[PDB]
Amino acid sequence: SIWYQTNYVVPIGAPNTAYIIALAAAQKNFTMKLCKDASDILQTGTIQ
Amino acid sequence: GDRVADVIESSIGDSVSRALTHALPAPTGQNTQVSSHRLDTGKVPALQAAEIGASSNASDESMIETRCVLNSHSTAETTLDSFFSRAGLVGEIDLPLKGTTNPNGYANWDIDITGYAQMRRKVELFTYMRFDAEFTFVACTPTGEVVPQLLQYMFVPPGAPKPDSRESLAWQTATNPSVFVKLSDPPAQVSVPFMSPASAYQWFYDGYPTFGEHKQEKDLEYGACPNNMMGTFSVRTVGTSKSKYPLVVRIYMRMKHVRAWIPRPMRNQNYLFKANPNYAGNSIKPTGASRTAITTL
Amino acid sequence: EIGASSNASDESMIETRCVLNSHSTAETTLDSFFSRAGLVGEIDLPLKG
Amino acid sequence: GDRVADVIESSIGDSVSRALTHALPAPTGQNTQVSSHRLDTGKVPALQAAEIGASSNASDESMIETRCVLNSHSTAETTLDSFFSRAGLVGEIDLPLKGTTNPNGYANWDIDITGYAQMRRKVELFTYMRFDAEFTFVACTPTGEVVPQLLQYMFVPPGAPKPDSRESLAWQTATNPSVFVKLSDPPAQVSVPFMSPASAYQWFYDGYPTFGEHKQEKDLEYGACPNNMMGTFSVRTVGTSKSKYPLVVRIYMRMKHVRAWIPRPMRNQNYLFKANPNYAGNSIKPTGASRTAITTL
Amino acid sequence: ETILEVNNVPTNATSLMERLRFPVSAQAGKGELCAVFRADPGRNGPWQSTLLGQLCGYYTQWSGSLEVTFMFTGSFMATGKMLIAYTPPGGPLPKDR
Amino acid sequence: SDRVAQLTIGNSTITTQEAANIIVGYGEWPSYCSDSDATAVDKPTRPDVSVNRFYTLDTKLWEKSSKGWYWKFPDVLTETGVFGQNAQFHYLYRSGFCIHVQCNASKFHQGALLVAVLPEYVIGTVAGGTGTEDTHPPYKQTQPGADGFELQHPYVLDAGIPISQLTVCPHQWINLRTNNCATIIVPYINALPFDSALNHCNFGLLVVPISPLDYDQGATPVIPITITLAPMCSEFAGLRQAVTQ
Amino acid sequence: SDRVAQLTIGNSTITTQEAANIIVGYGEWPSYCSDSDATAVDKPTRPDVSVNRFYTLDTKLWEKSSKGWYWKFPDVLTETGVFGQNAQFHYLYRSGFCIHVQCNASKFHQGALLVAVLPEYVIGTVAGGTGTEDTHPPYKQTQPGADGFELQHPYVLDAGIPISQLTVCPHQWINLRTNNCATIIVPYINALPFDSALNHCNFGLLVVPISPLDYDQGATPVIPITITLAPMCSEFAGLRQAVTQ
Ligand SMILES: CCO/N=C/c1ccc(OCC[C@@H](C)CCN2CCN(c3ccncc3)C2=O)cc1
Ligand SMILES: CCO/N=C/c1ccc(OCC[C@@H](C)CCN2CCN(c3ccncc3)C2=O)cc1
Ligand SMILES: [Cl-]
Ligand SMILES: [Cl-]
């Protein structure tokens, strides 16, 4: 969860709204096991 | 650094689990030593104090005059692998034609071996068990007949798409493991590793799987632990049209490379459900045979 | 903006204990991921079709 | 023993209070070194950043061209003992004849030096103070006259019986320390050790002396700390009949072997009560003289 | 690192690019809530937009620490302090800051 | 010299002049989780003395007709002392326990209680009597808290298993003509290094009269059984706000 | 390289890109009580990570007319987290603190806050205005809890002493054109080795605007001041039941 610790402050002449972009990935202790098919199958009918 | 005395002389943190006992080798039963008449005051092997919680340490030699017996009876047949590495029935899947259950040509089996008493009672002797296993799949019609039918078995781990029909896209099986075999071929057979996220599966989980108020509705999840839920086993006739014959697949499991911890009292009331130890209350039966009197055989 | 992923680690963001991690990374190699046979083609040989 | 890494490499427990600064000797004021014109870019002593919280480190030598000055001005007179070891008035006891207060020939003085501004303002510069003291007792009639009267002073520590009259059994003084002296004799004078149960007396205690709800009634005990209450000082004319003369005893205290910690802003509003820093709200005055404008002297 | 769709709410085609970022703006100083999301990487939700979440989809089990880096794209004159918190299992969505 | 004992841990001390030795479950002492077994990365908190101490939680009355009771760990302490607080503020918890069941009488009373520890003690229901109803025990029964819960059918330990075989678990007996207490040290038992003190009860404590209490009209009839226990080597991790369940 | 900083302790991390160094009160770091200074005999409990961490307790709004506020330690944490619990269950407590006051604005705002720490901060009353009434401040004012309390007469710090001399105490300034935070490490200060976290507030934190906030119509007018703090080397002793006051 993200909360305002203080407040977004800006002077006269600057926008009152800005955006944040979030990037994510795993640390170096990350590992996965037991291969399985993904839950999605991107196909509805036959692929021509 | 640490300077205050209580911190220096602290035990907070030793990971070494000091053990009171250790295992010794015992390939055969213990021998019996010669013994003679002892008429001593002070020494008294026969007297015990069961309140302590330990079994009696009195031996044959000290209770009667014994001869010498070199016992070479093997103890090999009572090892966990000897006891468990015998394949037994743990699941049945029906693929009927014009029936109620599966008239669509496929079937999904929740991987749970607790549906059969024999096998179940054996594993429930221990609380935690870690092992690999060999699964064998025997298929035939309901009369035990063999017909020229091709089948596909697929292991669908938690999170993978469960087939919803005989023609489901999931049978493309690009990553899941599948097995294609004919009823005419011998029983399909594969090895399965220890797949739990825990260090061991456990036949008993005295707890709930999630946080929150555990109201009546959710009381079905008491005792349910995901670490024991390995997934789904799906089977289907391999075709776009209904199969001409009804089928039955019997699943046999043979554990191997077994380790177990914490022995428990063995089940003594009929089993009723897979998920719990529920027993028939109006039918509590003694553990064994009874007799008319304590003074008569 | 640089274009590289964050180099911040657990140890520097919170007080951590020591953990000897022996979790294998073998199952995520290309051969482990791809060397599983899957359907790639179907051929039909019907009678009166 | 300790085996888990985080415990071995822990700092939990070091009693060594690592200090950033240490004291150097300084019997005299610092000398001034010769300096010349510096026209450098990069070096800039004059510029500071008070936000940091430290005082300016700029020195005479770097702000102007200075000559050499060997400064031998002593710093001895500003040591705590030099500042405090000067006896000042801290208490007055009246023993009148036909009056209202003490017409019974004796008097009990609660040992508290906060009744006089001069002395009080000085000690309140620090929060904690530890010291021994020399007390001097000057007695005479209200006109400053000396008469042939014998007096008894007695120190009654917390828990000892406070005299309730000129003839009280407590004056037997079998264990308490008492002093017998005539008004004609010179002022009685004794040495008093550091008697607190704490390592130091404290002129400020931001707290309550006991647990429980701190309702209005008990708000008088806010700031009261027993560690500062050394007892009662009782005095009486030594007789079974009323004294012929009215008396006054002025108590002077001279601290010695002084140690103090934590400097505080110095009192700038008139004192009103012994027990607290209460000030007259409708009369908040500036700390010092004022002027008509910021641009005129 | 790949972009995490914390703002996975709009769905009409013309507004899809909006899912790629969430906003912040002048508040009333009551330590107001900005956004929330589950940390479960292999679950439906924001993580589904990341390559990590997608690859994660081919494995039944996973183990490891994750990390999320937030980039502020407001003007250079804008300032501010935020409190980002991770609440381990068992803790309900935090009522207040 | 084996009938007399003293247990001191934290700011608490227990004495007994009629003991019958001490049992160390599965033959091993409680110990902190090693860096090899551990998996969570945050540095744990080990309160030590403030939580590893003797808590005396409950007293039951033994009667000529009592059936027996059970309590669950760590459920019993989740709302008690500094231990409870730590159990609530942290997601992860692990510890061992020193259990001391007390029950004294006179040299003219008789009776025997079996005091045992049963890991992963799952409770079952009588399934509607006929076994056709798939009923489940309510929260109040699986995690009875400090008050414990009385057994309905002791012979099968309310779980379809013979109490006659319960001695295969760490245990002691309180035979009034011999001892007035049982002491059992138990190490952390689970298939994971740490776990939730709230959602999972590692084991259950059972106190069941196998040989019924008896005495003659006129002897004190009120015979209490008191339960005292102390966590050992408590470790907590995964801090956050306090949660009761 | 002095304007940028990171404070990590427990499971909490603080960052700032406009700092002005760090003050270490009276020049010394917090440290546990030595065996020489100690007097109580029971072995203390040192929770470590579960209590020595950053707690963000309160936010105030700075206005062109604000007078200034104060908070008291350890009063502010007595009812928060695992620290609060330990403070309540134990009679004795001691710790140091790392205080971090936050307040950012824009390069077009101006104003300066004096952030200081004043040991044994005793509060006085205006004595009925005339000084003839011996009034005393109520519990709510001497120990305001987490909400802090607004100063009535800043010039005399509501205690008859000049705020102009408050800089003789560990302090920093938050001058909006320079920094957006103050950080002060404080060691345990008292004439006793341990003391009650309930009855005694070792020191007070004062945040007072000396140079009033100002800006032009149109710039964000809501400028918060947030208080975050972390106990250091917390030690507790004299266990018993929990007490709130
Ligand atoms: C190509 C497809 O072939 N795959 C065959 C297959 C067979 C078995 C597979 O997994 C078997 C896992 C079982 C050994 C786990 C049995 N257990 C573990 C503990 N447990 C359980 C059940 C009920 N309550 C508690 C625990 C179980 O039922 C997976 C794939
Ligand atoms: C034979 C009788 O002679 N005894 C003389 C005598 C004189 C002084 C004695 O004790 C003097 C103790 C004072 C130095 C203590 C003054 N203090 C300590 C701190 N304190 C105080 C007052 C109000 N608020 C906080 C602290 C004080 O007033 C005892 C006996
Ligand atoms: Cl409690
Ligand atoms: Cl809290």
* CA distance between the termini of chain F: 45
List of chains touching C (3+ CB pairs within 8 A): A, B, D, E, F, G
d(Cα B170, Cα A37) in Å, to the nearest integer?
A: 8
Of G228, G207, G224, the closest CA to residue G105 belongs to: G224
CB-CB neighbors (< 8 A) of G105 in chain E? 79
d(Cα B272, Cα B283) in Å, to the nearest integer?
A: 12
Q: How far is CA A20 from CA D72, D136, D284, E84, in A?
A: 65, 75, 51, 13
Of G182, G239, G211, G146, the closest CA to residue G18 belongs to: G182
Q: How far is CA D243 from the centre of its chain?
A: 35
Q: How far is CA F119 from the centre of its chain?
A: 10
Helices (H), G62-113: 81-89
G102 reaches A (C-beta below 8 A): yes
Breaks (C-N over 2.5 A) in chain G follow: none
Reduced to 3 states, what is the DSSP secondary structure of residue G50?
Answer: helix
Q: With the C-alpha atoms ordered F138, F140, F145, F147, is the resulting torsion angle positive or negative? A: negative
Burial class (CB in 10 A: 0-12, 13-18, 19+), D25: exposed
The answer to whether the CB atoms of C36 and B175 lie below 8 A apart is yes
**Phi, psi torsion values for D82, nearest 5 degrees:** -65, -40
Helix (H), strand (E) at residue E52: helix E51-56
Residue type, F97: F
E strand map for chain G: 5-9, 12-16, 23-24, 55-62, 69-73, 90-102, 110-119, 149-150, 171-175, 181-186, 203-214, 223-239
Work out the number of other CB atoms within 10 angstroms of the CB of residue B30: 12
d(Cα G83, Cα G87) in Å, to the nearest integer?
A: 6
Given a contact cutoff of 8 angstroms between Cβ atoms, the answer to whether D35 and D62 are in contact is: yes
Given a contact cutoff of 8 angstroms between Cβ atoms, the answer to whether B246 and B97 are in contact is: yes
| Strand-pair partners of B180 | B152
Ligand 2, atom 30: nearest CA belongs to which residue? D155
G103 reaches A (C-beta below 8 A): yes
Distance F231 CA to ligand 3 centre (A): 15
d(Cα F81, Cα F49) in Å, to the nearest integer?
A: 12
Contacts of F198 (CB under 8 A, 6+ apart): B211, E90, F78, F87, F88, F243, F244, F245
Nearest-atom number in ligand 2 for the CA of D196 is 18
* CA distance between the termini of chain D: 75
Residues D252, D256, D262, D265, Cα dihedral to 10°: 40
Residue D259: both structure tokens together: 């140690």
Contacts of D130 (CB under 8 A, 6+ apart): D194, D196, D199, D200, D201, D258, D259, D260
Residues B12, B17, B20, B25, Cα dihedral to 10°: -160
Helices (H), chain D: 5-8, 60-63, 80-84, 117-123
DSSP at B17: -
- Which among B135, B171, B195, B267 is the best mutation to test ligand 1's pocket, defined by most ligand atoms within 8 Å of the CB? B135
Q: Which phi-psi region, left, alpha or beta, contains residue F191 (left: φ > 0; alpha: ψ -120 to 50)?
A: alpha
Given a contact cutoff of 8 angstroms between Cβ atoms, the answer to whether F105 and F176 are in contact is: yes
Rg from Cα positions in chain E: 15
Label each residue of C1-49 as H, E or C.
Answer: CCCCCCCCCHHHHCCECCCCCCCCCHHHCHHHHHCCCCCCCCCCCCCCC
The answer to whether the CB atoms of D12 and B8 lie below 8 A apart is no
CATH number 2.60.120.20 is the correct assignment for the domain at D1-297: yes
Given a contact cutoff of 8 angstroms between Cβ atoms, the answer to whether B88 and B116 are in contact is: yes
Q: Is the CB of D92 under 6 A from ligand 2?
A: no
Name the residue in chain B with its Cα closest to that of F129: B281
Residue D285: both structure tokens together: 């005055």
Of D265, D264, D266, D255, the closest CA to residue D82 belongs to: D255
d(Cα A8, Cα E26) in Å, to the nearest integer?
A: 5
Given a contact cutoff of 8 angstroms between Cβ atoms, the answer to whether F195 and F202 are in contact is: yes
Any long-range contacts for C30-36 (C-beta under 8 Å, 24+ apart)? Answer: C32/A35, C33/A35, C33/B175, C33/E58, C36/A35, C36/B174, C36/B175, C36/B176, C36/B177
Give the residue extent of every domain in chain D.
1-297
Ligand nearest to the CA of G78: 4
Contacts of D241 (CB under 8 A, 6+ apart): none
DSSP at G83: H
Given a contact cutoff of 8 angstroms between Cβ atoms, the answer to whether G188 and G95 are in contact is: yes
Distance B105 CA to ligand 1 centre (A): 23
Helix (H), strand (E) at residue B95: strand B88-95
d(Cα F183, Cα F99) in Å, to the nearest integer?
A: 6
The answer to whether the CB atoms of E60 and B175 lie below 8 A apart is no
E strand map for chain F: 5-9, 12-16, 23-24, 55-62, 69-73, 90-102, 110-119, 149-150, 171-175, 181-186, 203-214, 223-239
Helix (H), strand (E) at residue G142: helix G139-142
Residue type, D72: S
d(Cα G198, Cα G244) in Å, to the nearest integer?
A: 7
The experimental method, as deposited, was: X-ray
Of D94, D95, D83, D87, the closest CA to residue D122 belongs to: D83
State the DSSP string of F4-34: -EEEEETTEEEEESS----EEGGGB---PPP
Q: With the C-alpha atoms ordered F173, F174, F178, F181, is the resulting torsion angle positive or negative? A: positive
Given a contact cutoff of 8 angstroms between Cβ atoms, the answer to whether B220 and B279 are in contact is: no
Q: How far is CA D249 from the centre of its chain?
A: 21
What CATH number was assigned to the domain covering residues F1-245?
2.60.120.20
d(Cα D14, Cα G30) in Å, to the nearest integer?
A: 10
d(Cα G153, Cα D279) in Å, to the nearest integer?
A: 11
Ligand 1, atom 21: nearest CA belongs to which residue? B228
Distance D86 CA to ligand 2 centre (A): 16
Helices (H), chain B: 5-8, 60-63, 80-84, 117-123
* Strand duo A31-35 + G203-214: pairing: unpaired
Buried b vs exposed e over E32-53: b needs ≥16 C-beta within 10 Å? eebbebeeebbeebbbbbbebb
DSSP at D78: G
d(Cα B7, Cα F46) in Å, to the nearest integer?
A: 13
Residue F205: both structure tokens together: 């404590």
Which residue carries 């019609």 as its tokens?
B141
Residue type, B143: T
Name the residue in chain C with its Cα closest to that of B197: C23
Contacts of B37 (CB under 8 A, 6+ apart): B65
- Which among B151, B228, B264 is the best mutation to test ligand 1's pocket, defined by most ligand atoms within 8 Å of the CB? B228
Q: How far is CA G85 from CA B192, F245, G51, G58, G79, in A?
A: 49, 18, 10, 19, 7
Rg from Cα positions in chain D: 27
Residues with CB under 6 A from ligand 1: B 111-114, 133, 135, 153-155, 177-179, 190, 192, 201, 203, 228, 230, 233
Distance G89 CA to ligand 3 centre (A): 8
**Phi, psi torsion values for F150, nearest 5 degrees:** -85, 140
DSSP at B28: B
Give the residue extent of every domain in chain G.
1-245
CB-CB neighbors (< 8 A) of A33 in chain C? 23-24, 27
The answer to whether the CB atoms of A26 and E6 lie below 8 A apart is no
Helix (H), strand (E) at residue B150: strand B150-156
Residue type, E44: N
CB-CB neighbors (< 8 A) of E65 in chain C? 10
Angle at G213 (CA atoms; ends G208, G216), nearest 5 degrees: 175
Residues G29, G31, G37, G40, Cα dihedral to 10°: 140
Contacts of D159 (CB under 8 A, 6+ apart): none
Q: How far is CA G67 from CA D44, G106, G114, G123, G172, in A?
A: 36, 21, 12, 16, 18
**Phi, psi torsion values for E18, nearest 5 degrees:** -70, -25
